[PDB]
Amino acid sequence: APKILQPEARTDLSLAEGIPERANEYADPASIQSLFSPGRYLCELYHVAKELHEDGNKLHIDKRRPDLQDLVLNNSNMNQEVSSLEILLNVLQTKTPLDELTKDTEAHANDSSFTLPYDDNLTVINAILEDKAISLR
């Protein structure tokens, strides 16, 4: 535990300033390459989290979501305002593609709202005809 404190004790900064003691090799704050970043927190949380199940289980992270293994730690991935409901659709289309829904058969196992005998094409036509103030009638 003081062996963690000693690199925290020797550097303290990386501007020279003369009178306090400084060591080199800093990073820009508010970036993934920093040490208190969301990237470092994500790295620590992932390397904790992939050690809680056996690798052969179905509850392991790389077995339930192979997407998180290949996430690029980049400042573009940090700061870009990507919308949600895109990531969900990408993860759901990773397992089963979208054309499987159009090719799908009938009479499924009693789901709510009955959306499963699904055709994307009629939905696209209907939603394009929504805002244009044109019904099929």
Binding site: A1, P2, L5, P7, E8, A9, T11, D12, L13, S14, L15, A16, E17, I19, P20, E21, N24, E25, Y26, A27, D28, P29, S31, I32, Q33, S34, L35, F36, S37, G39, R40, L42, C43, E44, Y46, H47, V48, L68, Q69, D70, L71, V72, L73, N74, N75
Partner: protein, 242 residues
Amino acid sequence: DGDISLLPPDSLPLVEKLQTSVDELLSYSTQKDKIGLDAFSGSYGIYFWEFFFHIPFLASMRFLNEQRFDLAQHWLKYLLNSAGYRDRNGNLLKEGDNILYWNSLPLQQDTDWDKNTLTLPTDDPDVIAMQDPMQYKLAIFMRTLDLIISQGDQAYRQLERDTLAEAKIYYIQASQLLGSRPDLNRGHQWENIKLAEESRQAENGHFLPPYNEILLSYWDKLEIRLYNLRHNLNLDGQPLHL
């Protein structure tokens, strides 16, 4: 038993120097011979840490909180003075060629601590700062910069052009204490790592502990306030000249 003294150093010269000024008491020459280095720690060490270091702290921060800035600066001159310890007849008070800047005694040297295992329960920053004195050394430097920019802001709220000319000099002095602004993102540039190449531990060579936050924000404060001074903007961006 075993080279531990229960005795204090002699309290008579401290009473000799109470009757003179405070400046002849809270000085490095009285902290050399009359109080040891190893005697600054030890049995009566809490009183000496407090009396020669935390008394100018809670004096100067109390003067800052009550907005007496010209006397708030005077009590940080008993901790950090920038080439100013002279003792009334020239004589910058060097050790060898080292011009003395830190009046306090544990801030003068660079010491190693060996005891403090498992700070992970102790969330106190003061125990961490008593482990290595560079934390207090950074704290006094940041309070000096806060106090100088507060004196500049005090000479900026009166909005007279003589007072603005008086106000610009404090931001000059703050930019002279800070030195020159360092570069950023110019050592071990971040390669796009896909999070399965990482390790659990540190020192992989990629996460690289950063530059300070408050000393980085001081450059931005001085930049905004000098940009307001070099036009007729106020602090709110309001033009003084219509």
